[PDB]
């Protein structure tokens, strides 16, 4: 479940839990099925120093499916393998000594539907 300040005992001047990163926004031009997203850093970071910025992507609205897509420091990753004329949910979060904290709102980005065949 959640740490809930449980388990670990006899702590020692331990830092506080980090904060949620700024919702991921679109950067540049959103192509058919390929767009980059960059999230601003925490304006009020707790008593912890960011360690890594992990992001997740899900199939539009319906179909709750979140799987790691990027990992590193750069506050910007290209979400490839997308689908045109469809929805997509994304969420960014920061990781620190105190594990990961609540995720950012869902970033709904609609891709442009190219004029092409569907069924054939």
Swiss-Prot record:
Q: Which domain of life is it from?
A: Eukaryota
* Disulfide bridge partners, by residue number: none
Where in the numbering of this chain does the Fibronectin type-III domain appear? Answer: 20-114
- Where does it live in the cell? Golgi apparatus membrane
Tissue specificity of this protein:
Expressed in the odontoblast and nerves in the dental pulp. Also expressed in trachea and to a lesser extent in the brain, liver, lung and kidney.
Question: Which residues, by range, are in coiled-coil regions?
Answer: none
Hey, which family's this protein in?
Answer: Belongs to the FNDC3 family.
Q: What does this protein do?
A: Mediates spermatid-Sertoli adhesion during spermatogenesis.
Name-wise, this protein is Fibronectin type-III domain-containing protein 3A
Q: Which organism is it from?
A: Homo sapiens (Human)
Q: Report the portion of the entire protein shown.
A: 554 to 660 of 1198
